[PDB]
Every structure is written in structure tokens, then in C-alpha cells.
């Protein structure tokens, strides 16, 4: 048969010895008919009462064994999956067949040396009739290593068939065997029968062409066709009173659709959750939430498909700024035939500018692309090279964007301001420490309330910016404020920072300098 | 049987490190390479009972169009038992050529019971297939135990060349062999060949061409030297000085400070007073040399930070205790990431040459960008430890040579 994967118990630990809870005589009978046949098939074997090990068993009839103890003692195995494919990476096939693999775990031997730890007991009806003890000869359902051992066996059992038929794509997933090709209808159905026979000659039985699922294949939240994909049917609920819970589930489903529905927005909706006190709390919808909801249900009313990846053609990724801190993008090959789309809103840091944030979106998209297609796309960006270099060269962190082409599709991203690199001759000079003193004798000591040593160092500067003219030189002792302004944000979480930013955009020339303590 | 029994440090278990996703080009190179290492018994396909993992990568090389497999054994290297010198003569040689002798390892089998810890996975695009799994049968390139275990055999082999060419300093580190000689560059490369071929006797292509340790002069702190000094200049100068006073306490500011008397316009020009010209000149002298009393002790970690100086320039420092730099340098001449990786390697090749250890790097780059691009430019056979940070504003100021 198929080779055996050796298994071990964790270091130190000993097999399981948990006693069988009382079993109803109606259940004992059932289990004896079930266990006696499993011994007729090869699954199990009776063992002499010297095997101290035992694992509980109840009846549902189907025998369901409770392995949560043996599992705790069984060695760690190599991860069963950790990652399913994304539709956008799949290739277009002429035919795709899904083959359910029955009694999968049942058709795979279990390391002999390990079996004695799979010992279980069927209690005798009579206070002294059987009292039989069994152990497994194959992979037990519910046992820690069955998914891993099964998949690893299937891979080997598939290898040859795969060498013989290199024009057949086969994807294994737990219990399903998705088989695809570009063969003509007839030839495909024959390969699907051969394969079916290949598994069988290893004991693995499958469903006939009559009983096998036909696409669209509903998988992991998607709807798969041989030639395209989308997310399963989902339009929004109609209601008068929305509960926090409903909102969160709503926001959840709209996001999910973003991978293929460009235009979905969740902001006004998300905003409803502010200060919410209970999942069951009602929240009426703002005029803006209703508009956003109304537009989402319209976008979600006309279904959109996503074509598959054609490896012969390049990958193009195009990004757009859809609001402050909001980015949308779509990756396509055939001009505008979307392989995938998505939105990006992550603000890494308390402050940033559209340039840093667009660059971070390019890294997220790059990483994503490497996972799904194994390469990075040619990027189309709403930013000119000169704006880019200009912030690049002057920033302290190191960064790098792959080959990209500027695309004049507003809003174009840019820097709203820039700090001079040299003090300005003829501009008044403010020394701020919560107030300031100018070289022309002006002063504005103001005592703030509910402040923070840091928010105070930022208010100093803000005051100086307001009372000063179009050109100004500012001197601060704060390394902190210095860091923030010098990074040249155009957006922040802080309103204060946002105020300073509006101020900086208005100035003609601003020069910031730092000096220590001792003003 | 023949193998040397190796164990992990006490109590430690094998590495379970996540494999960063790779591009199909690299996977393609990794499949071709590993298929061959398997046909030759170097590595074996493993089953699901091995739970361990170490990441793999493919890189390009020097003087070749072929790919090199690079196994990130950092984690395993740290869980591997210690094995129970270092020629300071090396940093004094006129030249040093670096050789890749990592191949010498594929002859010594590996303790059968340790193999499972060398497990690695070749990933698949978009998760469409499980991932090809393997473990080592022989000493693997990149593992701390390989040089240690092949040491006997490596001395025996070098024994001859050693006595025969006493004018050469041959130092080994991981998969690399360092060859130093004050001979003229002309004859230098000729003597390297007589070593390569003497290795074939029992192969080794070049890494980098030579390095010249002799002129690895430190990059001291400098103050601007100008004709007229504005108020802004004096403020930058004092700020710089005050921070440098953390290292050199002989630095005095008092006089220059009496210049920023009050609130003067930033651009106002301030002629320097006698008391002051002398204070600057004297602080100037203290900085001409690196601070005394800075000694390296093998007992602690070597930390290295790099700063972006803009316009293709970077600065860096090596220390064990803050402010106590063992070395501080520069690097210039591509894109940000390409440079960062070359500097990182250049600075690593230096700590190895100077102290025999790779330093811990503090890099100024978002992690995902580094993880995405470092392999496109990496040429070394080793990988140093690194963490990611943000470079404060003023640290750069205080570290470069602007005119
Ligand atoms: C088997 C061929 C493979 C593929 O390249 N394209 C398609 C197209 C349509 C499908 F229904 C499935 C798949 N495929 C696949 O692996 O699907 C798993 C993610 C479920
Ligand atoms: Mg001040």
C-alpha cells in the first residue's frame, strides 16, 4: 500500500489512559456492529488486556472517538495548509471537476508502533461478557496527524499521475480534489475517469460523473467558474433600525467585497460605531451613512466577475487616492479586465503625507502580488517622478518603488509645503518655549489647559506660525516637534498638528531649527 | 555512524521559522538547485512528521550567471551547542581576497539525529501546491556547526600551503575563507590561484576581488569651517558640540554660547570673539581623534547603525556600549535598498575581518520593503542579525561631512 509515516508522542509523555464513560446498552450494541466491521475492513484489531492505554468513545449510529487527550500527547506535525489560493491567481481552464475523496483517512496506514496509543474500549453489556479492546490500523478521524498524513500521502499518490498528465492542474484541499484542464469536453471526462481509477487502485473511492458537483464552485467565500470568479451573492439588508451588531456585520461584508467591487466605501458606516455602548444598541443612520449605503447597494446590484491570471501577459497595478488616508487600486492584465481590486487605508504612524502613504500602498500591493502571482506588477501612479524623488532624497528612511509610470489621473499626489533648508533673511524670528519672543520684540505667553508636555511644545510653534507673516524662522528646543514637522506630514490624528499643517501650507517660507536647553 | 554527534543547547527545540514568500524566478532556481542536491544524496525529501523549518532564498553571484541557494540558519545557529582563534594580523594585510569554500561541506555526512532540524520548504506560488520539503544529509552551508565540524579536515588540507607560504594569513569564517597578503596586487591574485587549485587538490570562486583593510581609517566628527558665522550656524554648532560632549567631555561651549546673547535674527552675522575662536579651535582638536579607552571585548554584542545621508550617502557606527564607537565610517555609490544591502554587507565583512563576528544591525527601513528586496542584491553567504528602526532627525546632522 502507501508507505508509513512514523509518529511519536511528545517528549516525556506517555500514551492516553482515560476511562470509558458508561455506555447505554443500546449504544454498546451499535458500537459492536460498527467496531466488528472496522475489524473486517482492516481499520482496527482486537488487543490483549495488557495495553494500559485507552481513549473514550461515545455513539452518535456513527462511532465518534474522543481524541482530545491523545492529541495533547501526540507530536507536532508540519502545518496542514496555512494559506489557500486566491481566485485572481488561478488560471483559466476549459473544464474543472471537483472530486470528493471518501473515507480518505480510512485508506491510509498508521505507524504500527503508534497504534497501541489508539486503544479504545467497548464496554460489555453483561457485567462480564466481552469488554473488547481495539486499536487503529489506519488514520483515525479526529487525530492530530490525520490531516497532515493524509495530504502528504495524497501528494505522493498524485505525483506520477501528474508526471504522466502535465496538462492537468490538480489542487488538493482537505477533502476535495479540484481537477482542471483545457482538454476538450470528452478527453477531460476520460482523464477524470482514469484519475478516479488511479485513486481507487489505492483504495481511495470517489463519486461518479453523475454525482460530482458542477460549477459554479462555491469555495472559501467565492464563486468559481472555469473562466471567471466573484464573491458569492451579497446585497445589503433593508431596515429601519440598525444595531451596532448589524453595522459591524455590514461593514464586514462590504470590506469583503472590496477585493472585486471597486467603489465600496465604509467610512460613514464605520463612524456610526463611535461611543457605542452595546452590541444591541440602535443607531439611526446619518444622511451620509444612508448615501454611502444607498451607493453600496447599487454597486452591489450589478455583479462583477474577475478574470483569471494569464501568465503570458504582464501585470499592471493602478492606484488612486479616494480621500484623505484612503486608497483604492486594481490590478489587471488585459486593459481594464480586473484580476483583482482592493482598498488601502492603513496609516502607519500618527502622521504622514500622501507620498509616504502611497509608497506604503505600493509595498502592500507588491507583497500581495508576490504571493498571488509570484511577481510584481508594473505600477501606474498619480504622482510625478520629480515629486517622488524630491521626497525620497530628503527622507531619512530608505525606500524603493519598482518600475512605475506616472498617470495623470487626479487627484495627483504632491507635497503641500516644504521647509526651507536655510534660515530666511528678512523673516522675523520666533524663539518658542507656551509662548514666544521674536527678534523684533514681540511676545505671546499663553497658559494652556489639559495639555501634555509634548502637545505644549507643539502649541508654542503653532502660536508662532499664526502671529507671523508669510515668511518666518522658528526656533524650538523640542526634538519631538522637530521630528514631526521635519517629516513634513499633510495629515495627522492630532487636530493641533492638522492646524500647524494648514498654517505651513499657507506660508511662503518656513524655516525650523532646534537648540537644546539652558528662551 | 561516521558523523559527529551534534545537539542543541540544553532544553532547546528545533526552529519553526516562517518562510517569506518568494517570486517564481527564485522558486524556479531553488527547484532546479535542490532537485540536483537530492539526486546527489545531499538533501532528502521529508514527511509531515518533521515540524521544523528554516527559510531558504536564491541569490545571484559574482562572475557567474548561476544562482546560489542561501539558507537562513540564523535561528538554528542560535540553538546549536557551542563547540568546546582570531588573527588580528588579518586587518593589517595590504589585501584580502574572500573565497567561497562552502562547497567543502558536502562531503561530511550530518549526525542522523540532527538532520530534522535542517528542514526547509520551497514554497509555491499562490499556495497552489503544499510546498516541497527537505532536510540535510550532509553539513549544510550556513550552519554554525559546519565549519566547526569540518575544521580538522580543513586544517590538514591547509597545513601545506600554510607552512609553504608563511607570508599568507588564511582565516575561515562560516562558508568563507579570508586570504591576506602584503604582496603586490599584481602577484597577489597569482597566489590566490595557487590556493584555489590546491583546494581542488582535495571549487572556491571569488566573492567581491580584494578588500584593503590597511586603509580602513575611521570617520571622525568634524565641525563646519566657514568664513562668516550666522546666528543659525552658531546654534547648529553648539547643538552639535553639546551632543559630542557626551563622548568628549573636554568640549566646552560657554564662549560660543555668549554669542547667542538673547533673541537675535537667525541670519544675523556674528563675528567670533577671541575667547571663542580659541574654544572652537580647541574643541576642533579634541575631535581630530576617536575617543580613548574604547576596547572591544568578545563577551558582548557588536551593534551597528546606519544613517541615510541623502544623495547616495550613508554613515554608520559600530559599538558595544553607546557612545563608545569601535569604528565609524561612510558609504556612497542604484536605489535606497540596493545601497543599504551593500553597506550592510560591507560593514559585515569588516566586523568579521576586524573582530571575527557579524554585528547586529539597526536598519532605517520599513521591514516589508527590506524583506521584499534584500535578496535581489545580496551576495554574501552569511546573514547578520537585524532589527528595524526610525532614525531620529538630529542623529544624521551630527554624523556627516557636508562642505
Ligand atoms: C484546478 C484548476 C485551478 C485553476 O488554475 N483554476 C481554476 C478555475 C476554476 C476553478 F473552479 C478552480 C480552479 N483551480 C483551483 O486550483 O481552484 C482551487 C482554488 C479551488
Ligand atoms: Mg527655545
Amino acid at each position: 500500500p502507501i508507505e508509513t509515516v512514523p509518529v511519536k508522542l511528545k517528549p516525556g509523555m506517555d500514551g492516553p489512559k482515560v476511562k470509558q464513560w458508561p455506555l447505554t446498552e443500546e449504544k454498546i450494541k451499535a458500537l459492536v456492529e460498527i467496531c466488528t466491521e472496522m475489524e473486517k475492513e482492516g481499520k482496527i484489531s482486537k488487543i490483549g488486556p495488557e495495553n494500559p492505554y485507552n481513549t473514550p468513545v461515545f455513539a452518535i449510529w456513527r462511532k465518534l472517538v474522543d481524541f482530545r487527550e491523545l492529541n495533547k500527547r501526540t507530536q507536532d506535525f508540519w502545518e496542514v495548509q496555512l494559506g489557500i489560493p486566491h481566485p485572481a491567481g488561478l488560471k483559466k481552464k476549459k473544464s474543472v471537476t471537483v472530486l470528493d475523496v471518501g473515507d480518505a483517512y480510512f485508506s491510509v496506514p498508521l505507524d504500527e508502533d503508534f497504534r497501541k496509543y489508539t486503544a479504545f474500549t467497548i464496554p460489555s453489556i453483561n457485567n462480564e461478557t466481552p469488554g473488547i479492546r481495539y486499536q487503529y490500523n489506519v488514520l483515525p478521524q479526529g487525530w492530530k496527524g490525520s490531516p497532515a498524513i493524509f495530504q502528504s500521502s495524497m501528494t505522493k499518490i498524485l505525483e506520477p499521475f501528474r508526471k504522466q498528465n502535465p496538462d492537468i492542474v490538480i489542487y488538493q484541499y482537505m477533502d476535495d480534489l479540484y481537477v482542471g484542464s483545457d482538454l476538450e469536453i470528452g478527453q477531460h471526462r476520460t482523464k477524470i475517469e482514469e484519475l478516479r481509477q488511479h485513486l481507487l487502485r489505492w483504495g481511495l473511492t470517489t463519486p461518479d460523473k453523475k454525482h460530482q458537483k458542477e460549477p459554479p464552485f462555491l469555495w472559501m467565500g467565492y464563486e468559481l467558474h472555469p473562466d471567471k470568479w466573484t464573491v458569492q451573492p451579497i446585497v445589503l439588508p433593508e431596515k429601519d433600525s440598525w444595531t451596532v451588531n448589524d453595522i459591524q456585520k455590514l461593514v464586514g461584508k462590504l470590506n469583503w467585497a472590496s477585493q472585486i467591487y471597486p467603489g465600496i466605501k465604509v467610512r460613514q458606516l464605520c463612524k456610526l460605531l463611535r461611543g457605542t455602548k452595546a452590541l444591541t444598541e440602535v443607531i439611526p443612520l446619518t444622511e451620509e451613512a444612508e448615501l454611502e449605503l444607498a451607493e453600496n447597494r447599487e454597486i452591489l446590484k450589478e455583479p462583477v466577475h474577475g478574470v483569471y491570471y494569464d501568465p503570458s501577459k504582464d501585470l499592471i497595478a493602478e492606484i488612486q487616492k479616494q480621500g484623505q488616508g484612503q486608497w483604492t487600486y486594481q490590478i489587471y492584465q488585459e486593459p481594464f479586465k480586473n484580476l483583482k481590486t482592493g482598498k488601502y487605508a492603513r496609516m502607519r504612524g500618527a502622521h504622514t503625507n500622501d507620498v509616504k502613504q502611497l509608497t506604503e500602498a505600493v509595498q502592500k500591493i507588491t507583497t500581495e502580488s508576490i504571493v498571488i502571482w509570484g511577481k510584481t506588477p508594473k505600477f501606474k501612479l498619480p504622482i510625478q517622478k520629480e515629486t517622488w524623488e524630491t521626497w525620497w532624497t530628503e527622507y531619512w528612511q530608505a525606500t524603493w518603488i519598482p518600475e512605475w509610470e506616472f498617470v495623470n489621473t487626479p487627484p495627483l499626489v504632491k507635497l503641500w509645503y516644504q521647509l526651507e533648508k536655510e534660515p530666511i533673511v528678512g523673516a522675523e524670528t520666533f524663539y518658542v518655549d507656551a509662548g514666544y519672543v521674536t527678534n523684533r520684540g514681540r511676545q505671546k505667553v499663553v497658559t494652556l489647559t489639559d495639555t501634555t508636555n509634548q502637545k505644549t511644545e507643539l502649541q508654542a510653534i503653532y502660536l508662532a506660525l499664526q502671529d507671523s507673516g508669510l515668511e518666518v524662522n522658528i526656533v524650538t528646543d523640542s526634538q519631538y516637534a522637530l521630528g514631526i514637522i521635519q517629516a513634513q506630514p499633510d495629515q495627522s490624528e492630532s487636530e493641533l498638528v492638522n492646524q500647524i499643517i494648514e498654517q505651513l501650507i499657507k506660508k511662503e517660507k518656513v524655516y525650523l531649527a532646534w537648540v537644546p536647553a539652558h528662551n | 555512524i561516521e558523523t559527529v554527534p551534534v545537539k542543541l543547547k540544553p532544553g532547546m527545540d528545533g526552529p519553526k521559522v516562517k518562510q517569506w514568500p518568494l517570486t517564481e524566478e527564485k522558486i524556479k532556481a531553488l527547484v532546479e538547485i535542490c532537485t540536483e542536491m537530492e539526486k546527489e544524496g545531499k538533501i532528502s525529501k521529508i514527511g509531515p512528521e518533521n515540524p521544523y523549518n528554516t527559510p531558504v532564498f536564491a541569490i545571484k553571484k559574482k562572475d557567474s550567471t548561476k544562482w546560489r541557494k542561501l539558507v537562513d540558519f540564523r535561528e538554528l545557529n542560535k540553538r546549536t551547542q557551542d563547540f568546546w582563534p582570531h588573527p588580528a594580523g588579518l586587518k593589517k594585510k595590504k589585501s584580502v581576497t574572500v573565497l567561497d569554500v562552502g562547497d567543502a561541506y558536502f562531503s561530511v555526512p550530518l549526525d542522523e539525529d540532527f538532520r530534522k532540524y535542517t528542514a526547509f520548504t520551497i514554497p509555491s506560488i499562490n499556495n497552489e501546491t503544499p510546498g516541497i520539503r527537505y532536510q540535510y544529509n550532509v553539513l549544510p552551508q550556513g550552519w554554525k556547526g559546519s565549519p566547526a565540524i569540518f575544521q580538522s579536515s580543513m586544517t590538514k588540507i591547509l597545513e601545506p600551503f600554510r607552512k609553504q607560504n608563511p607570508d599568507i594569513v588564511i582565516y575561515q569564517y562560516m562558508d568563507d575563507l579570508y586570504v591576506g597578503s602584503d604582496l603586490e596586487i599584481g602577484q597577489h591574485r597569482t597566489k590566490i590561484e595557487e590556493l584555489r587549485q590546491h583546494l581542488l587538490r582535495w571549487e572556491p570562486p571569488f566573492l567581491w576581488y580584494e578588500l584593503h583593510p590597511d586603509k580602513w581609517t575611521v570617520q571622525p566628527i568634524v565641525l563646519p569651517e566657514k568664513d562668516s558665522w550666522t546666528v543659525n550656524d552658531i546654534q547648529k554648532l553648539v547643538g552639535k558640540l553639546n551632543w559630542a560632549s557626551q563622548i568628549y567631555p573636554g568640549i566646552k561651549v560657554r564662549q560660543l554660547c555668549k554669542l547667542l546673547r538673547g533673541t537675535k535674527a537667525l541670519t544675523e552675522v556674528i563675528p567670533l570673539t577671541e575667547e571663542a575662536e580659541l574654544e572652537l579651535a580647541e574643541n576642533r582638536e579634541i575631535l581630530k581623534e576617536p575617543v580613548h579607552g574604547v576596547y572591544y571585548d568578545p563577551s558582548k554584542d557588536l551593534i551597528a547603525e546606519i544613517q541615510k545621508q541623502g544623495q547616495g550617502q550613508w554613515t554608520y557606527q559600530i559599538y558595544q556600549e553607546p557612545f563608545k564607537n569601535l569604528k565609524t565610517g561612510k558609504y556612497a555609490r542604484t536605489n535606497d535598498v540596493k545601497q543599504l544591502t551593500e553597506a550592510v554587507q560591507k560593514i559585515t565583512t569588516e566586523s568579521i575581518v576586524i573582530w571575527g563576528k557579524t554585528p547586529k544591525f539597526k536598519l532605517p527601513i520599513q521591514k516589508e520593503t527590506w524583506e521584499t528586496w534584500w535578496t535581489e542584491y545580496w551576495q554574501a553567504t552569511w546573514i547578520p542579525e537585524w532589527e528595524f528602526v526610525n532614525t531620529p532627525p538630529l542623529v544624521k546632522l551630527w554624523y556627516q561631512l557636508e562642505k
Side-chain angles (χ1 to χ4, degrees), chain A residues 241-258:
Chain A
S241 81
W242 290 79
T243 240
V244 170
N245 189 72
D246 301 309
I247 306 274
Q248 300 188 292
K249 289 182 71 174
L250 181 65
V251 170
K253 301 202 292 175
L254 263 339
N255 287 71
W256 176 251
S258 308

Side-chain angles (χ1 to χ4, degrees), chain B residues 44-101:
Chain B
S44 285
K45 288 220 181 71
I46 53 170
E49 357 60 75
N50 183 315
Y52 306 111
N53 201 248
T54 282
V56 258
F57 302 100
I59 53 186
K60 180 186 182 172
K61 251 278 306 205
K62 178 216 175 181
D63 199 61
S64 274
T65 177
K66 314 163 194 169
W67 298 89
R68 178 177 174 62
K69 167 175 168 240
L70 176 66
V71 183
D72 183 7
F73 282 122
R74 277 176 291 171
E75 191 53 24
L76 179 82
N77 283 335
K78 288 180 280 197
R79 317 188 164 204
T80 292
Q81 72 165 70
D82 325 77
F83 298 89
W84 287 26
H86 183 43
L90 188 64
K91 60 191 133 62
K92 297 206 310 300
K93 267 53 193 61
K94 282 191 169 298
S95 305
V96 190
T97 293
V98 192
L99 255 31
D100 187 3
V101 302

Side-chain angles (χ1 to χ4, degrees), chain A residues 430-433 475-478 515-517 519:
Chain A
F430 296 60
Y431 293 72
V432 315
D433 252 271
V475 188
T476 172
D477 63 2
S478 185
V515 299
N519 303 187

Side-chain angles (χ1 to χ4, degrees), chain B residues 149-161:
Chain B
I149 290 177
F150 184 96
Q151 190 54 63
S152 305
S153 324
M154 180 61 106
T155 312
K156 184 201 297 289
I157 305 181
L158 302 174
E159 185 185 66
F161 206 98

Side-chain angles (χ1 to χ4, degrees), chain B residues 354-365:
Chain B
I354 300 176
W355 308 287
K357 326 297 160 49
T358 64
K360 275 68 202 298
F361 286 89
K362 282 183 177 157
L363 310 174
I365 184 179

Side-chain angles (χ1 to χ4, degrees), chain A residues 85 89-93 96 169-171 178-181 215 217 219 224-228 308, chain B residues 128:
Chain A
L90 301 180
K91 290 141 216 60
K92 174 183 170 181
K93 289 287 158 288
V96 180
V169 173
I170 304 198
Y171 171 81
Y178 290 78
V179 188
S181 76
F217 293 112
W219 174 90
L224 303 180
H225 291 281
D227 45 84
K228 61 201 175 189
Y308 292 119
Chain B
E128 289 173 44

